[PDB]
Amino acid sequence: VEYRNWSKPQCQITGFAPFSKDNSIRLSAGGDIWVTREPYVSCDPGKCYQFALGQGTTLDNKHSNDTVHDRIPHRTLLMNELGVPFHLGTRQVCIAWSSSSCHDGKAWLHVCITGDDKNATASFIYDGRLVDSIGSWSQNILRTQESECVCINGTCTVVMTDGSASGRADTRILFIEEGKIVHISPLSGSAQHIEECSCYPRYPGVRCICRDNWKGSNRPVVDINMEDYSIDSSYVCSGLVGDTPRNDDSSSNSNCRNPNNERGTQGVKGWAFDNGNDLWMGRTISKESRSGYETFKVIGGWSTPNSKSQVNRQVIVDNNNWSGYSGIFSVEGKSCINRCFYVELIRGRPQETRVWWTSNSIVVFCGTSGTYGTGSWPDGANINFMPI
Amino acid sequence: VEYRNWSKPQCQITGFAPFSKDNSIRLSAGGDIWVTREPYVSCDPGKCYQFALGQGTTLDNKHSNDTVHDRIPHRTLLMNELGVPFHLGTRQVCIAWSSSSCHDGKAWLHVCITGDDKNATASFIYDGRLVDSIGSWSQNILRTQESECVCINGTCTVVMTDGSASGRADTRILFIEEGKIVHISPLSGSAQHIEECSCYPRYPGVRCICRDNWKGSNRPVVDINMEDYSIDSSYVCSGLVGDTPRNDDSSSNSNCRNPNNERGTQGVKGWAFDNGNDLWMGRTISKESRSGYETFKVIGGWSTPNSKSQVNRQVIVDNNNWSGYSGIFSVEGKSCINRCFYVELIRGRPQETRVWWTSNSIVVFCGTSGTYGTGSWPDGANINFMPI
Amino acid sequence: VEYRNWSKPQCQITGFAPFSKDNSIRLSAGGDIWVTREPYVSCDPGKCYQFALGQGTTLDNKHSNDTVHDRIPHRTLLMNELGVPFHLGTRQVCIAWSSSSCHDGKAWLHVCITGDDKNATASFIYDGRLVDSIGSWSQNILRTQESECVCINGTCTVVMTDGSASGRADTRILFIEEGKIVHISPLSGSAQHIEECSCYPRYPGVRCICRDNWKGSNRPVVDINMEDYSIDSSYVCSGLVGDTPRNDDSSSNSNCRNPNNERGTQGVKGWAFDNGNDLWMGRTISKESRSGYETFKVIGGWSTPNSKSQVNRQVIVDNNNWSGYSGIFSVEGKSCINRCFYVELIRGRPQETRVWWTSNSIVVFCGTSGTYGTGSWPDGANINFMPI
Amino acid sequence: VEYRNWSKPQCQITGFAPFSKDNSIRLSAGGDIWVTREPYVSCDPGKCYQFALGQGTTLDNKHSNDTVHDRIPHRTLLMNELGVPFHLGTRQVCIAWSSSSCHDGKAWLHVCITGDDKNATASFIYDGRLVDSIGSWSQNILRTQESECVCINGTCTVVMTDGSASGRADTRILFIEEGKIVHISPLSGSAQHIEECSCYPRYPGVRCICRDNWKGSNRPVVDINMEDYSIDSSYVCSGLVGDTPRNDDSSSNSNCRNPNNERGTQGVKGWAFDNGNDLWMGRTISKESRSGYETFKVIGGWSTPNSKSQVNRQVIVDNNNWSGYSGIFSVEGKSCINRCFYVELIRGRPQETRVWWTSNSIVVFCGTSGTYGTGSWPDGANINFMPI
Ligand SMILES: *[C@@H]1O[C@H](CO)[C@@H](O[C@@H]2O[C@H](CO)[C@@H](O[C@@H]3O[C@H](CO)[C@@H](O)[C@H](O[C@H]4O[C@H](CO)[C@@H](O)[C@H](O)[C@@H]4O)[C@@H]3O)[C@H](O)[C@H]2NC(C)=O)[C@H](O)[C@H]1NC(C)=O
Ligand SMILES: *[C@@H]1O[C@H](CO)[C@@H](O[C@@H]2O[C@H](CO)[C@@H](O[C@@H]3O[C@H](CO)[C@@H](O)[C@H](O[C@H]4O[C@H](CO)[C@@H](O)[C@H](O)[C@@H]4O)[C@@H]3O)[C@H](O)[C@H]2NC(C)=O)[C@H](O)[C@H]1NC(C)=O
Ligand SMILES: *[C@@H]1O[C@H](CO)[C@@H](O[C@@H]2O[C@H](CO)[C@@H](O[C@@H]3O[C@H](CO)[C@@H](O)[C@H](O[C@H]4O[C@H](CO)[C@@H](O)[C@H](O)[C@@H]4O)[C@@H]3O)[C@H](O)[C@H]2NC(C)=O)[C@H](O)[C@H]1NC(C)=O
Ligand SMILES: *[C@@H]1O[C@H](CO)[C@@H](O[C@@H]2O[C@H](CO)[C@@H](O[C@@H]3O[C@H](CO)[C@@H](O)[C@H](O[C@H]4O[C@H](CO)[C@@H](O)[C@H](O)[C@@H]4O)[C@@H]3O)[C@H](O)[C@H]2NC(C)=O)[C@H](O)[C@H]1NC(C)=O
Ligand SMILES: *[C@@H]1O[C@H](CO)[C@@H](O[C@@H]2O[C@H](CO)[C@@H](O)[C@H](O)[C@H]2NC(C)=O)[C@H](O)[C@H]1NC(C)=O
Ligand SMILES: *[C@@H]1O[C@H](CO)[C@@H](O[C@@H]2O[C@H](CO)[C@@H](O)[C@H](O)[C@H]2NC(C)=O)[C@H](O)[C@H]1NC(C)=O
Ligand SMILES: *[C@@H]1O[C@H](CO)[C@@H](O[C@@H]2O[C@H](CO)[C@@H](O)[C@H](O)[C@H]2NC(C)=O)[C@H](O)[C@H]1NC(C)=O
Ligand SMILES: *[C@@H]1O[C@H](CO)[C@@H](O[C@@H]2O[C@H](CO)[C@@H](O)[C@H](O)[C@H]2NC(C)=O)[C@H](O)[C@H]1NC(C)=O
Ligand SMILES: [Ca+2]
Ligand SMILES: [Ca+2]
Ligand SMILES: [Ca+2]
Ligand SMILES: [Ca+2]
Fold first, then answer.
1. Any residues with CB less than 8 A from the CB of C324 and at least 6 apart, and which?
2. Which long-range contacts (CB under 8 A, 24 or more apart) does D166-171 make?
3. CA angle B116-B118-B121, nearest 5°?
4. Domains in chain A, please, with CATH?
5. Candidates C59, C65, C352: which one to mutate for ligand 7, based on the most atoms within 8 Å of Cβ?
């Protein structure tokens, strides 16, 4: 088994096709299913796996009460094959209220953060054993991507932040070989706040589309050079911005360089990727709440500041239903690298107060060069049918 | 591992022997089991797997209410080893309210259809990744076999229809290599309506026995040439017809060429296969409802129009019990290719209204050249013992 | 992978040591566990599996009512790794209300009987596919071993009976190669009634200790010659007889040749094996009911008619607790063949009427050349804690 | 596959990082989970497994009542991949109320003790078959490590004791090759009472840190020579002693040679390991009860009698939360052997009398050469939310 290089051209895509759905919440109403949030997807050379941060409890369980909270010692990283719901036989891979995972072609790497808010620790698990760890450097919620990291030629990269959620923070990019941290580069460039990066291989380098939780409703971009460890950053050009909250389409802006200062505070994990001058992206349909989900291509969305010409829109989740986090993952095909994405479908608190828990299911789509129709694939659970 | 060729003679059979039963409904009264319908069986070179379309819920679950409906966004293709009930550890292979699966000798292909009725999308998944997709071509419920597709020398074939359920439709035959559509041939021949084909390898080609939902209670036949992609079609000769509804044996007819216009509208997925001039087939015992199941050989049933001389009858499910869909699958033996079949055993609505759900279990038989006795292997659940 | 030959001397044992226990009934009171009976154990070259005949239902399930009955269409053969309880993820290997399984060194053989009492069918499944089948020859409950069959050099042998439970019956020995019946020999010798044989490899042949349900409380012996298919039979010499019911130790007899006509009617599956002139055997402690279980060595028990000198007794289940069926299995060690046995621990009806179901757990012991102490390992469930 | 030699230097560590947590009790409140105690962790060359002694029942189950008791016939050794909770699909590896497991590089060895207090039997299972067994030698609760044994070059060593819990007993060290006992050495040296050793490879030998239940609150040390089977023993030098109960830090003593006679009676399983003259160890935070858990390094703690200079302390479980047993396990890295430990988190009786059961979850940490922060990772279950 050889290290992955991802050295194939990116697949030409016309849009995305349905790939997977786990129906977690619907199942939780009649079965023992983990309470989760912050899910993602990543694949080894053979097959795909779904991940999520458990809350150390199932849903029909009094411990599900008040699981809206982000960080407790009982959160662990869950790992199943894609499409296998998080049942009681699910393996907890490590202790984590923040995590990232990727396969280098030989074995799995897991980056897992847990512990006190002011003094967290990140554990690096490779091939089933703990190889390294690092402590918080800003004493303010060390946190990472909540989606797959990416490895090229045996070196994996992952983006971590420590510091304010609403002000300048300390972002660093780690380079890891077989679980061992070999280099750390400070964030550099014009991005002013970085969280929860959705990264993908763009041989010879790596590209990440992130969340600015401070001043921008446009998404920061981070470029990682795997040859000399240099870092660059900026913002997605598209005038159709990908964060939530954000201004409506007629009054939103991006100049590619700075945060737009348009409803910039707060945000949601999301993704996008470049194709020449064009940009493929997803976003919530609602501009102020984590509701609905849509994807489209923006003409000149990568190269032209403020471009708002859109095409090939697809509704993934209609605006009558809740969404949440979303992220990218890459799949090596026979001749090219395909891009896929997942959408987190959050149910319960704070939006739905009949119940006392917070959880999610997922829906997953993959890039296609073929054709496709329309639909809507929401969580699908009836809140009135749920254990409270 | 090499591609399958299925280039062996068909096993000479004297009838069928008991092979498997999953007892799904009985187990649902005391455990968490998926609500399903439209099951089928397919085998890789090593072992058999049962498939079914989930309803995104377990049975003892308020979400099981009103699952009689055919198409919702939450339906997914379930896949287990044959004989493992669909418990919560079951993998959802893809999003689908219509599907087909087959193994080409190296990897699994799954064809999955989901989305809006008027604008559905079919996804083609091969070796665990999305390789292709196609959109609806007649904007009227794109739909496929609900049983195994078949592959010869790395090329898999699958029958898809789009259009009217009770009128002329648009049926196409797809040829797929490693998930990629390489050719599409329109239906051709004298079959006037084609749905839910049960196909089997008949080297060098593929033969399908289908469901005519429009004018025929006789079953359409589709012949697929894998070498030049040419298609031919007709109807099964046997005057003992295999659809439901149908006329009784004394007044049923087939001329091998046209639909018989005998209680032709509506129908049920079924199967049959040729052996020289003779025909092996299954059918519901009841001529008007999906009740009971029987198999038998029709002498001259393949070659002689309107033949009604039957032999080697076996009751599979007695007429006091509900059946449903049925389909064929092929298993490669040491010297020959065996033919097996599964029967869907539908419980709940519309027939049993004490409960609000609709689900099924299955029973499976395989061709034998030995001897056998008699019996009846129904679902066996007591409707009064079920969660409503 | 090569065929098993079992061509090593038998291990010299001083008794038996604890090997496994599944705690099924205890777990059934707080989880979804199959209702079973007629368990057995068989190992492939790597690891052991437990088998049982399910009743198509879990215990905490209204369908468990009246599962005292031996034969319904919903009984299937269950197969798990030894020590894994029969939970909802258990694979149902085939339809069976009577069965036998064994591994020839390359793949598993399963012999499964189901259908009408007067016209049953036996299916032979090898390497996950149906290879052969045979119908009832006496039209009176075709039935087999309910424990492992044994294979030498690619040929497996299994003992089947069809006919009266309380009179002369028609017993046949089948020889099966890769699932294909290659020869059938009639029972021969002086054994007058044969049921439920516990067989073991005794290179170059196979030896079975069985149940006489008609005239003997002494156990019949069947000797199977794998080279020329010839059969011989007689009775265990030991004056300490292994069946239940039976006379007490001071008035029980055996002449090695004929049934003893001592409370000979009815019986229970049991086992024994020769070591030179001596005999290792197990039996219920009670002489009239399936209560308790003990093993011991009888000096001259194999060669000397009516020998009653016992040594190395071990209590497996104390007489205050229910037992049931028991059987042998053989495990190839580095230099020798070891013998092990399991005991079925039956709970519920007819003996315990607070509940309406009948089920079992198991305990398993293996021969040892080392030393050991004492104990008692019963089912352990509190009938008052059980779902009725 | 080759035998393990553990012939690499010990990893230089700065402390420990979070590795795993199973949340068993929290999950038991909403799911079917085994009642357990005496857990441990051990790894094959590829992955880690968690073990525990089941009580033959799940938690939400009337049979969970009064599971505070240490020894019943229904206790079995449970084995899952690390991070997989003990659900109903868990394999019971053997019958045991005391056990030890390890992998020699080729296969698993399991040492399982069960039976009467005064006449117990230890079974030795290697590669899935029983190879040896030994009976009680002092007729007073034969017992072993309750943590992993260790194997060097095909020979595994395990420490067993039989006799008084509060007086001189008979401790022996067994050397086992492929399940077969090849030598037995009596304990030797100055350690006066030995129980529940936590052993680790220290090439060319094996070192164990144990529990003195009679006269010492300082932990005994057992040194095992794998080449000539010679044994030596003593006590840990550190004046900061590791047992519970124990004196507080200002009046606790150890002279390296004798039990300290400081609250020596009773105790708890624990661990420690040497690095040059220094010592890494864990212990409960409370000095009289199994509450809280902490780790630290004692400068000169291995070589200097009564040393009390501590550094690199970490809280694992805060003193508001219950702990219990703990033990070491070793993981082979690319260049070095790392040391890890697990902590048993006991909930229920005798400490929490609202419920009638006794069970545990676990948390697991591994040695790191990196950095880390702080936290607390207790069981986390709310006793008021539990089935009683
Ligand atoms: C059957 O399914 C197909 C495939 O999904 C579908 O074709 C798609 O239709 C959409 C909607 O018209 C197209 O996307 C649009 O592209 C135009 C540019 O030509 C954009 O201007 C659109 O964006 C504007 O309008 C959106 C609302 O539709 C707004 O939300 C947005 O803010 C803009 O104002 C939009 O991106 C897409 O290109 C095609 N896809 C393909 C491959 O042709 C078809 O419509 C479906 N059939 C039916 C009858 O529903
Ligand atoms: C024990 O099991 C064996 C094997 O199953 C069984 O033998 C079978 O009996 C059936 C029923 O008689 C045979 O099938 C028949 O074949 C005749 C031609 O010879 C047909 O005419 C029959 O069809 C007519 O009758 C059917 C009702 O039985 C009608 O439904 C149908 O419409 C026709 O009117 C039927 O096909 C079959 O050939 C044998 N099988 C073999 C291999 O011999 C036997 O009867 C069983 N014994 C008992 C006592 O149950
Ligand atoms: C600790 O464990 C060991 C091993 O289990 C145990 O030693 C065994 O004791 C039994 C009982 O005495 C021995 O078996 C007996 O052998 C004598 C011949 O020497 C037989 O006569 C006995 O059978 C008669 O008595 C039985 C009641 O015990 C009756 O049930 C039976 O009908 C006969 O009348 C019996 O077979 C066995 O040989 C030893 N095993 C060994 C290897 O020594 C020991 O006793 C245990 N210690 C205690 C105090 O529990
Ligand atoms: C963030 O996390 C880091 C890493 O855990 C942490 O640094 C650690 O702090 C502890 C506690 O101060 C240090 O351990 C101490 O070492 C000194 C020797 O210098 C000992 O004297 C201490 O033992 C005494 O005090 C203990 C109470 O803390 C008593 O329980 C004990 O009986 C002794 O009286 C203790 O061992 C440790 O060395 C560092 N680790 C490293 C690598 O620096 C830091 O404090 C955390 N920061 C915050 C603000 O949470
Ligand atoms: C979830 O936990 C909350 C907090 O304990 C529960 O709500 C509280 O219930 C108490 C008692 O009725 C009230 O006095 C408090 O005012 C409530 N707190 C809040 C924040 O409203 C709630 O009952 C729990 N939910 C369930 C289903 O157990
Ligand atoms: C399943 O859903 C049906 C339809 O919603 C429920 O039946 C309805 O119940 C309401 C409330 O009593 C009535 O007003 C409607 O008239 C009912 N509809 C019909 C068609 O009867 C039914 O209660 C649900 N079943 C279960 C078991 O919850
Ligand atoms: C198991 O089934 C039996 C039979 O249906 C039930 O017992 C019967 O109950 C009816 C109605 O009360 C009585 O009239 C019969 O006399 C009973 N039959 C017998 C044989 O006694 C029984 O209730 C069921 N058990 C459970 C727990 O549901
Ligand atoms: C667990 O078992 C205990 C002991 O059997 C049960 O407590 C007993 O209950 C009986 C009946 O009420 C009393 O007479 C005894 O005095 C109790 N024993 C003690 C020592 O208190 C208890 O009910 C069981 N717990 C549960 C939840 O079923
Ligand atoms: Ca923002
Ligand atoms: Ca029709
Ligand atoms: Ca008898
Ligand atoms: Ca002590």
1. C37, C268, C290, C343, C344, C345, C346, C360
2. D166/D213, D166/D214, D166/D265, D167/D214, D168/D192, D168/D193, D168/D214, D169/D138, D169/D140, D169/D193, D169/D194, D170/D137, D170/D138
3. 55
4. 1-388 (2.120.10.10)
5. C65
